[PDB]
Protein backbone atom coordinates (compact mmCIF):
# COMPACT_ATOMS: atom_id res chain seq x y z
CA UNK A 583 0.00 0.00 0.00
CA UNK A 584 1.14 3.51 -0.97
CA UNK A 585 0.67 6.73 0.97
CA UNK A 586 -0.82 9.65 -1.00
CA UNK A 587 1.80 11.90 -2.54
CA UNK A 588 2.30 15.02 -0.37
CA UNK A 589 1.73 18.25 -2.34
CA UNK A 590 5.32 19.45 -1.84
CA UNK A 591 6.97 16.39 -3.52
CA UNK A 592 7.44 16.64 -7.34
CA UNK A 593 5.76 13.71 -9.08
CA UNK A 594 8.78 13.07 -11.36
CA UNK A 595 10.97 12.08 -8.35
CA UNK A 596 8.57 9.31 -7.30
CA UNK A 597 10.06 5.79 -7.32
CA UNK A 598 8.12 3.32 -5.15
CA UNK A 599 10.85 1.27 -3.47
CA UNK A 600 9.77 -0.83 -0.44
CA UNK A 601 12.75 -1.19 1.92
CA UNK A 602 11.07 -4.02 3.88
CA UNK A 603 10.06 -5.97 0.75
CA UNK A 604 11.98 -4.82 -2.32
CA UNK A 605 10.47 -6.08 -5.53
CA UNK A 606 13.60 -7.86 -6.85
CA UNK A 607 14.55 -9.67 -3.62
CA UNK A 608 14.88 -13.15 -5.19
CA UNK A 609 18.08 -12.06 -6.99
CA UNK A 610 19.80 -11.13 -3.71
CA UNK A 611 19.41 -8.34 -1.16
CA UNK A 612 22.12 -6.02 -2.45
CA UNK A 613 21.02 -6.57 -6.07
CA UNK A 614 17.47 -5.71 -5.04
CA UNK A 615 18.61 -2.38 -3.58
CA UNK A 616 20.98 -1.60 -6.49
CA UNK A 617 18.00 -1.01 -8.80
CA UNK A 618 17.99 2.37 -7.05
CA UNK A 619 21.22 3.24 -8.93
CA UNK A 620 20.12 2.56 -12.50
CA UNK A 621 20.95 5.34 -14.95
CA UNK A 622 17.32 6.39 -15.28
CA UNK A 623 16.99 6.94 -11.49
CA UNK A 624 17.78 10.36 -9.96
CA UNK A 625 20.13 10.88 -7.02
CA UNK A 626 17.15 11.67 -4.73
CA UNK A 627 13.78 9.91 -4.95
CA UNK A 628 10.51 9.76 -3.02
CA UNK A 629 8.91 6.39 -2.28
CA UNK A 630 5.25 6.27 -1.34
CA UNK A 631 5.84 3.03 0.58
CA UNK A 632 6.07 2.71 4.33
CA UNK A 633 4.29 5.99 4.91
CA UNK A 634 6.34 8.05 2.45
CA UNK A 635 9.97 9.17 2.70
CA UNK A 636 12.95 10.37 0.66
CA UNK A 637 15.79 8.06 -0.45
CA UNK A 638 19.27 9.25 -1.36
CA UNK A 639 20.65 6.81 -3.95
CA UNK A 640 24.29 7.79 -4.54
CA UNK A 641 27.34 7.58 -2.32
CA UNK A 642 28.05 11.28 -2.76
CA UNK A 643 24.68 12.37 -1.34
CA UNK A 644 24.68 9.69 1.39
CA UNK A 645 28.02 10.99 2.76
CA UNK A 646 26.97 14.67 2.62
CA UNK A 647 23.77 14.01 4.56
CA UNK A 648 25.50 11.99 7.28
CA UNK A 649 28.04 14.78 7.84
CA UNK A 650 25.41 17.58 8.02
CA UNK A 651 23.71 16.83 11.33
CA UNK A 652 22.29 20.35 11.63
CA UNK A 653 19.90 19.65 8.69
CA UNK A 654 19.65 15.83 8.98
CA UNK A 655 18.81 14.86 12.55
CA UNK A 656 19.13 11.40 14.10
CA UNK A 657 16.30 12.07 16.61
CA UNK A 658 14.03 10.02 14.26
CA UNK A 659 16.27 7.56 12.40
CA UNK A 660 13.98 4.62 11.47
CA UNK A 661 11.26 4.26 8.86
CA UNK A 662 8.19 3.96 9.31
CA UNK A 663 7.62 7.27 11.12
CA UNK A 664 6.03 5.51 14.13
CA UNK A 665 9.21 3.48 14.65
CA UNK A 666 11.45 6.53 14.36
CA UNK A 667 9.40 8.48 16.90
CA UNK A 668 9.57 5.63 19.46
CA UNK A 669 13.32 5.17 18.79
CA UNK A 670 15.17 6.64 21.79
CA UNK A 671 18.34 4.51 21.97
CA UNK A 672 21.56 6.24 23.05
CA UNK A 673 23.81 7.45 21.38
CA UNK A 674 22.16 7.19 17.97
CA UNK A 675 18.96 9.11 18.74
CA UNK A 676 21.05 12.15 19.83
CA UNK A 677 22.91 14.77 17.75
CA UNK A 678 26.02 16.72 18.77
CA UNK A 679 26.60 18.40 21.17
CA UNK A 680 24.57 16.03 23.37
CA UNK A 681 25.63 12.81 21.59
CA UNK A 682 29.41 12.76 22.02
CA UNK A 683 29.52 12.23 25.82
CA UNK A 684 27.72 8.88 25.67
CA UNK A 685 30.02 7.55 22.94
CA UNK A 686 33.03 7.56 25.27
CA UNK A 687 31.33 5.15 27.66
CA UNK A 688 29.92 2.89 24.92
CA UNK A 689 33.42 2.86 23.37
CA UNK A 690 34.83 1.78 26.73
CA UNK A 691 32.86 -1.50 26.71
CA UNK A 692 33.25 -2.68 23.10
CA UNK A 693 36.50 -0.79 22.39
CA UNK A 694 39.77 -2.20 21.21
CA UNK A 695 41.29 -2.77 24.68
CA UNK A 696 38.24 -4.89 25.49
CA UNK A 697 38.55 -6.88 22.27
CA UNK A 698 42.23 -7.69 22.87
CA UNK A 699 41.34 -9.14 26.29
CA UNK A 700 38.68 -11.33 24.63
CA UNK A 701 40.95 -12.79 21.96
CA UNK A 702 41.31 -16.28 23.45
CA UNK A 703 37.59 -16.58 24.15
CA UNK A 704 36.77 -15.49 20.58
CA UNK A 705 39.32 -17.92 19.14
CA UNK A 706 38.35 -20.88 21.34
CA UNK A 707 34.62 -20.42 20.73
CA UNK A 708 35.16 -20.24 16.97
CA UNK A 709 37.25 -23.45 17.10
CA UNK A 710 34.85 -25.15 19.54
CA UNK A 711 31.78 -24.52 17.35
CA UNK A 712 33.50 -25.48 14.11
CA UNK A 713 35.16 -28.65 15.41
CA UNK A 714 31.79 -29.82 16.68
CA UNK A 715 30.24 -29.29 13.20
CA UNK A 716 33.06 -30.76 11.13
CA UNK A 717 32.32 -34.54 11.40
CA UNK A 718 28.59 -34.01 10.72
CA UNK A 719 29.01 -33.05 7.04
CA UNK A 720 26.06 -30.61 7.35
CA UNK A 721 24.92 -27.57 9.29
CA UNK A 722 22.26 -24.92 9.44
CA UNK A 723 24.83 -22.13 9.35
CA UNK A 724 22.59 -19.34 10.69
CA UNK A 725 21.35 -21.40 13.63
CA UNK A 726 24.51 -23.38 14.20
CA UNK A 727 27.21 -20.72 13.82
CA UNK A 728 26.24 -17.19 12.65
CA UNK A 729 23.94 -16.62 15.63
CA UNK A 730 25.68 -18.45 18.52
CA UNK A 731 29.29 -17.30 17.79
CA UNK A 732 28.86 -13.50 17.93
CA UNK A 733 25.90 -13.60 20.32
CA UNK A 734 27.60 -15.76 22.95
CA UNK A 735 30.64 -13.47 22.89
CA UNK A 736 28.36 -10.46 23.45
CA UNK A 737 26.39 -12.10 26.27
CA UNK A 738 29.68 -13.14 27.91
CA UNK A 739 31.03 -9.61 27.58
CA UNK A 740 27.80 -8.06 28.90
CA UNK A 741 27.32 -10.64 31.66
CA UNK A 742 23.88 -11.91 30.54
CA UNK A 743 22.63 -15.53 30.81
CA UNK A 744 22.92 -17.56 27.60
CA UNK A 745 19.42 -18.90 28.29
CA UNK A 746 18.04 -15.42 27.44
CA UNK A 747 19.31 -15.46 23.81
CA UNK A 748 16.11 -16.70 22.04
CA UNK A 749 13.87 -14.11 23.72
CA UNK A 750 16.34 -11.26 23.07
CA UNK A 751 17.12 -12.25 19.48
CA UNK A 752 13.42 -12.31 18.66
CA UNK A 753 12.93 -8.78 20.02
CA UNK A 754 15.92 -7.32 18.18
CA UNK A 755 14.69 -9.10 15.01
CA UNK A 756 11.35 -7.27 15.34
CA UNK A 757 13.20 -3.94 15.47
CA UNK A 758 15.19 -4.55 12.24
CA UNK A 759 13.25 -7.13 10.13
CA UNK A 760 9.73 -7.04 11.63
CA UNK A 761 7.39 -10.06 11.33
CA UNK A 762 4.14 -8.24 11.91
CA UNK A 763 3.69 -9.74 15.38
CA UNK A 764 5.08 -6.64 17.19
CA UNK A 765 5.46 -2.98 16.44
CA UNK A 766 8.83 -1.33 16.98
CA UNK A 767 7.47 0.51 20.03
CA UNK A 768 6.38 -2.82 21.57
CA UNK A 769 9.68 -4.60 20.89
CA UNK A 770 11.59 -1.68 22.39
CA UNK A 771 9.43 -1.63 25.50
CA UNK A 772 9.91 -5.37 26.01
CA UNK A 773 13.71 -4.96 25.76
CA UNK A 774 13.62 -2.07 28.23
CA UNK A 775 11.40 -4.19 30.48
CA UNK A 776 14.13 -6.85 30.42
CA UNK A 777 16.93 -4.47 31.31
CA UNK A 778 15.31 -2.45 34.11
CA UNK A 779 15.86 -4.91 37.02
CA UNK A 780 19.30 -5.88 35.68
CA UNK A 781 20.47 -2.27 35.57
CA UNK A 782 19.26 -1.55 39.12
CA UNK A 783 20.98 -4.74 40.28
CA UNK A 784 24.29 -3.70 38.79
CA UNK A 785 24.19 -0.08 39.95
CA UNK A 786 24.35 -1.58 43.45
CA UNK A 787 27.54 -3.58 42.88
CA UNK A 788 30.15 -2.00 40.56
CA UNK A 789 31.56 -4.54 38.14
CA UNK A 790 33.61 -5.35 35.06
CA UNK A 791 30.84 -6.48 32.70
CA UNK A 792 29.55 -4.07 30.08
CA UNK A 793 26.21 -3.37 31.79
CA UNK A 794 27.95 -2.53 35.08
CA UNK A 795 30.39 -0.19 33.37
CA UNK A 796 27.56 1.63 31.60
CA UNK A 797 25.21 1.63 34.61
CA UNK A 798 27.90 3.01 36.96
CA UNK A 799 29.28 5.37 34.34
CA UNK A 800 29.78 9.10 34.17
CA UNK A 801 29.23 11.22 31.07
CA UNK A 802 31.22 14.46 30.86
CA UNK A 803 31.91 13.89 34.57
CA UNK A 804 28.35 13.46 35.87
CA UNK A 805 26.57 10.25 37.05
CA UNK A 806 24.60 8.49 34.32
CA UNK A 807 20.93 8.04 35.20
CA UNK A 808 19.19 4.66 35.38
CA UNK A 809 17.11 5.60 32.35
CA UNK A 810 20.06 6.81 30.26
CA UNK A 811 21.84 3.55 31.07
CA UNK A 812 18.79 1.55 29.94
CA UNK A 813 18.68 3.36 26.59
CA UNK A 814 22.41 2.79 26.01
CA UNK A 815 22.46 -0.91 27.04
CA UNK A 816 19.55 -1.65 24.74
CA UNK A 817 21.37 -0.22 21.72
CA UNK A 818 24.40 -2.39 22.53
CA UNK A 819 22.10 -5.46 22.52
CA UNK A 820 20.73 -4.55 19.08
CA UNK A 821 24.22 -4.16 17.65
CA UNK A 822 25.47 -7.37 19.28
CA UNK A 823 22.58 -9.55 18.08
CA UNK A 824 21.81 -8.31 14.53
CA UNK A 825 24.85 -6.99 12.60
CA UNK A 826 27.65 -9.60 12.62
CA UNK A 827 25.05 -12.39 12.86
CA UNK A 828 23.60 -11.48 9.48
CA UNK A 829 26.82 -10.35 7.80
CA UNK A 830 28.46 -13.72 8.47
CA UNK A 831 25.69 -15.58 6.60
CA UNK A 832 25.92 -13.29 3.54
CA UNK A 833 29.68 -13.90 3.34
CA UNK A 834 29.43 -17.65 3.82
CA UNK A 835 26.63 -17.92 1.25
CA UNK A 836 28.99 -16.26 -1.26
CA UNK A 837 31.95 -18.47 -0.31
CA UNK A 838 29.72 -21.54 -0.74
CA UNK A 839 29.04 -20.63 -4.38
CA UNK A 840 32.48 -19.19 -5.21
CA UNK A 841 35.17 -21.89 -5.04
CA UNK A 842 37.54 -19.60 -6.95
CA UNK A 843 37.28 -17.19 -4.04
CA UNK A 844 37.39 -19.95 -1.43
CA UNK A 845 40.51 -21.44 -3.02
CA UNK A 846 42.22 -18.03 -3.09
CA UNK A 847 41.95 -17.75 0.71
CA UNK A 848 42.95 -21.36 1.28
CA UNK A 849 46.35 -20.95 -0.43
CA UNK A 850 47.17 -17.34 0.58
CA UNK A 851 45.75 -16.97 4.10
CA UNK A 852 47.33 -13.52 4.49
CA UNK A 853 44.77 -12.10 2.02
CA UNK A 854 42.08 -12.74 4.65
CA UNK A 855 42.03 -9.25 6.31
CA UNK A 856 41.76 -7.63 2.85
CA UNK A 857 39.01 -10.02 1.78
CA UNK A 858 37.17 -9.10 4.99
CA UNK A 859 37.20 -5.48 3.84
CA UNK A 860 35.94 -6.33 0.37
CA UNK A 861 33.20 -8.67 1.65
CA UNK A 862 32.09 -5.82 3.92
CA UNK A 863 31.68 -3.58 0.87
CA UNK A 864 29.96 -6.14 -1.36
CA UNK A 865 27.63 -7.51 1.34
CA UNK A 866 26.99 -4.28 3.27
CA UNK A 867 23.64 -4.64 4.94
CA UNK A 868 22.53 -1.65 7.11
CA UNK A 869 20.19 1.08 5.93
CA UNK A 870 18.82 3.69 8.33
CA UNK A 871 18.27 7.45 8.06
CA UNK A 872 17.53 10.91 9.37
CA UNK A 873 14.74 13.49 9.68
CA UNK A 874 14.87 17.06 8.35
CA UNK A 875 15.07 19.79 11.02
CA UNK A 876 14.24 22.67 8.67
CA UNK A 877 13.11 23.40 5.14
CA UNK A 878 16.19 22.72 3.05
CA UNK A 879 17.12 22.65 -0.63
CA UNK A 880 19.48 19.75 -1.25
CA UNK A 881 20.88 18.97 -4.74
CA UNK A 882 17.98 20.83 -6.37
CA UNK A 883 15.24 19.18 -4.31
CA UNK A 884 13.18 21.05 -1.73
CA UNK A 885 12.99 19.01 1.49
CA UNK A 886 10.40 20.03 4.08
CA UNK A 887 11.02 20.10 7.83
CA UNK A 888 9.91 16.73 9.25
CA UNK A 889 10.48 14.80 6.02
CA UNK A 890 12.26 11.52 6.67
CA UNK A 891 15.14 10.45 4.46
CA UNK A 892 16.58 6.98 4.10
CA UNK A 893 20.38 7.15 3.66
CA UNK A 894 21.31 3.53 2.98
CA UNK A 895 24.84 2.89 4.31
CA UNK A 896 24.72 -0.15 2.05
CA UNK A 897 24.56 1.73 -1.26
CA UNK A 898 27.68 3.93 -1.11
CA UNK A 899 30.08 1.07 -1.88
CA UNK A 900 27.76 -0.46 -4.49
CA UNK A 901 27.77 2.85 -6.40
CA UNK A 902 29.77 2.45 -9.63
CA UNK A 903 30.93 6.08 -9.15
CA UNK A 904 32.81 4.88 -6.06
CA UNK A 905 33.96 1.40 -7.16
CA UNK A 906 34.23 0.13 -10.73
CA UNK A 907 32.18 -3.02 -11.49
CA UNK A 908 30.73 -2.85 -7.95
CA UNK A 909 28.98 -6.24 -7.85
CA UNK A 910 32.20 -8.21 -8.52
CA UNK A 911 34.09 -9.41 -5.47
CA UNK A 912 37.77 -8.63 -6.12
CA UNK A 913 39.95 -9.35 -3.08
CA UNK A 914 42.78 -7.29 -4.66
CA UNK A 915 40.58 -4.23 -5.22
CA UNK A 916 42.98 -1.31 -4.81
CA UNK A 917 40.75 1.35 -3.17
CA UNK A 918 37.88 -0.32 -1.28
CA UNK A 919 35.44 2.56 -0.81
CA UNK A 920 32.34 2.06 1.38
CA UNK A 921 30.20 3.36 4.26
CA UNK A 922 29.33 -0.06 5.73
CA UNK A 923 30.11 1.16 9.26
CA UNK A 924 28.36 4.53 8.77
CA UNK A 925 29.63 8.06 8.29
CA UNK A 926 29.87 11.25 10.30
CA UNK A 927 29.69 11.54 14.08
CA UNK A 928 27.72 8.24 14.46
CA UNK A 929 30.54 6.05 13.08
CA UNK A 930 30.12 2.48 14.28
CA UNK A 931 31.49 1.83 17.77
CA UNK A 932 31.86 -1.94 17.49
CA UNK A 933 33.78 -2.24 14.26
CA UNK A 934 36.92 -3.50 15.99
CA UNK A 935 34.85 -6.28 17.54
CA UNK A 936 33.08 -6.99 14.22
CA UNK A 937 36.35 -7.22 12.23
CA UNK A 938 37.95 -9.59 14.72
CA UNK A 939 34.93 -11.90 14.65
CA UNK A 940 34.82 -11.94 10.84
CA UNK A 941 38.55 -12.59 10.41
CA UNK A 942 38.65 -15.30 13.07
CA UNK A 943 35.61 -16.95 11.43
CA UNK A 944 37.20 -16.97 7.98
CA UNK A 945 40.54 -18.28 9.31
CA UNK A 946 39.16 -21.05 11.52
CA UNK A 947 36.42 -22.20 9.11
CA UNK A 948 38.62 -22.48 6.03
CA UNK A 949 41.58 -24.32 7.65
CA UNK A 950 39.18 -27.01 9.00
CA UNK A 951 36.28 -27.08 6.51
CA UNK A 952 37.86 -25.76 3.29
CA UNK A 953 35.19 -26.99 0.89
CA UNK A 954 31.42 -26.80 1.23
CA UNK A 955 28.39 -25.90 -0.83
CA UNK A 956 24.70 -25.19 -0.42
CA UNK A 957 22.56 -28.25 0.31
CA UNK A 958 21.24 -29.70 -2.97
CA UNK A 959 18.06 -28.09 -4.28
CA UNK A 960 17.70 -25.48 -1.53
CA UNK A 961 17.15 -21.83 -2.51
CA UNK A 962 18.49 -19.27 -0.03
CA UNK A 963 15.79 -16.86 1.17
CA UNK A 964 16.68 -13.32 2.22
CA UNK A 965 14.82 -10.65 4.18
CA UNK A 966 15.26 -6.89 3.84
CA UNK A 967 15.03 -4.19 6.47
CA UNK A 968 17.07 -1.86 8.68
CA UNK A 969 19.54 -4.72 8.90
CA UNK A 970 19.03 -7.12 5.97
CA UNK A 971 19.57 -10.84 6.58
CA UNK A 972 19.76 -14.43 5.36
CA UNK A 973 16.78 -16.47 6.53
CA UNK A 974 18.46 -19.92 6.45
CA UNK A 975 21.70 -21.36 5.07
CA UNK A 976 21.94 -25.16 4.71
CA UNK A 977 25.56 -26.15 4.04
CA UNK A 978 27.01 -29.59 3.23
CA UNK A 979 30.48 -31.06 2.96
CA UNK A 980 32.25 -34.41 2.75
CA UNK A 981 33.95 -34.93 6.14
CA UNK A 982 36.79 -36.89 4.54
CA UNK A 983 38.11 -33.65 2.98
CA UNK A 984 38.17 -31.80 6.30
CA UNK A 985 41.17 -31.17 8.55
CA UNK A 986 41.07 -31.70 12.30
CA UNK A 987 43.22 -29.12 14.12
Ligand code: HEM
Nearest residue numbers: 673674818821822825826829868923924928930931932936
Ligand atom coordinates in the same frame (compact mmCIF):
# COMPACT_ATOMS: atom_id res chain seq x y z
C1 HEM B 1 29.09 -6.04 10.45
C2 HEM B 1 28.88 -5.49 11.65
C3 HEM B 1 28.34 -4.06 11.88
C4 HEM B 1 27.85 -3.18 11.00
C5 HEM B 1 27.68 -3.36 9.48
C6 HEM B 1 27.51 -1.97 11.72
C7 HEM B 1 26.98 -0.82 11.20
C8 HEM B 1 26.73 0.36 11.89
C9 HEM B 1 26.24 1.58 11.27
C10 HEM B 1 25.93 1.74 9.77
C11 HEM B 1 26.09 2.52 12.22
C12 HEM B 1 25.60 3.99 11.98
C13 HEM B 1 24.07 4.14 12.06
C14 HEM B 1 23.63 5.61 12.03
O1 HEM B 1 24.42 6.52 11.68
O2 HEM B 1 22.44 5.91 12.34
C15 HEM B 1 26.49 1.91 13.50
C16 HEM B 1 26.52 2.52 14.75
C17 HEM B 1 26.69 1.86 15.95
N1 HEM B 1 27.07 0.54 16.11
FE1 HEM B 1 27.71 -0.73 14.57
N2 HEM B 1 27.81 -2.17 13.06
C18 HEM B 1 28.33 -3.43 13.20
C19 HEM B 1 28.76 -4.00 14.39
C20 HEM B 1 28.48 -3.50 15.64
C21 HEM B 1 28.59 -4.25 16.85
C22 HEM B 1 29.04 -5.73 16.92
C23 HEM B 1 28.23 -3.46 17.87
C24 HEM B 1 28.22 -3.96 19.33
C25 HEM B 1 27.65 -3.22 20.28
C26 HEM B 1 27.87 -2.14 17.33
C27 HEM B 1 27.46 -1.00 18.01
C28 HEM B 1 27.09 0.21 17.45
C29 HEM B 1 26.68 1.41 18.16
C30 HEM B 1 26.56 1.52 19.71
C31 HEM B 1 26.44 2.39 17.27
C32 HEM B 1 25.94 3.82 17.59
C33 HEM B 1 27.05 4.86 17.58
C34 HEM B 1 26.53 6.29 17.67
O3 HEM B 1 25.35 6.56 17.37
O4 HEM B 1 27.32 7.18 18.05
N3 HEM B 1 28.03 -2.23 15.95
N4 HEM B 1 26.88 0.60 13.25
Ligand SMILES: CC1(C)[C@@H]2CC[C@@]1(C)C(=O)C2
Nearest residue numbers: 674820821825868870968
Ligand atom coordinates in the same frame (compact mmCIF):
# COMPACT_ATOMS: atom_id res chain seq x y z
C1 LIG C 1 21.65 0.80 12.60
C2 LIG C 1 22.35 -0.06 13.61
C3 LIG C 1 23.14 -1.10 12.91
C4 LIG C 1 23.18 0.75 14.56
C5 LIG C 1 23.42 -0.21 15.70
C6 LIG C 1 22.18 -1.03 15.80
C7 LIG C 1 21.38 -0.49 14.67
C8 LIG C 1 20.18 -1.28 14.27
C9 LIG C 1 21.05 0.86 15.20
O1 LIG C 1 19.81 1.22 15.67
C10 LIG C 1 22.24 1.76 15.12
Ligand SMILES: [K+]
Nearest residue numbers: 657666667669
Ligand atom coordinates in the same frame (compact mmCIF):
# COMPACT_ATOMS: atom_id res chain seq x y z
K1 LIG D 1 12.64 9.45 18.45
